[PDB]
Homo-oligomer: A and B are copies of this chain.
Amino acid sequence: AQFPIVGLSSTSYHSPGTQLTGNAIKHAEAVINIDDKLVSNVFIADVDEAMNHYD
């Protein structure tokens, strides 16, 4: 995923007889990758459950 970022600004006093140009604003971004799959497994035998005295 991508989260763009923005924000720059400026101000000035203008000299008469000239033409305004602009103040350059440039951006950036922060990306977030996705990890692999996380697992948690277990196995239980039947005879162990049959001989046990609790669940």
What is A's interface to B at a CB cutoff of 8 Å?
4, 9-14, 20-25, 35-43, 54
**Is there contact, CB below 8 Å, between B23 and A11?**
no
**Is there contact, CB below 8 Å, between B25 and A11?**
no
The contact of A14 among B10, B24, B37, B54, by CB within 8 Å, is B37
* Nearest-CB residue, chain B, relative to A43: B22
Contacts of A23 in B (CB 8 A): 40-42
**Is there contact, CB below 8 Å, between B41 and A20?**
yes
Contacts of A43 in B (CB 8 A): 21-22
Contacts of A25 in B (CB 8 A): 42
18 CB contacts below 8 A, A to B, read: A4-B54, A10-B40, A11-B38, A11-B39, A11-B40, A13-B35, A13-B38, A13-B39, A14-B37, A14-B39, A20-B39, A20-B41, A22-B41, A22-B43, A23-B40, A23-B41, A24-B42, A25-B42
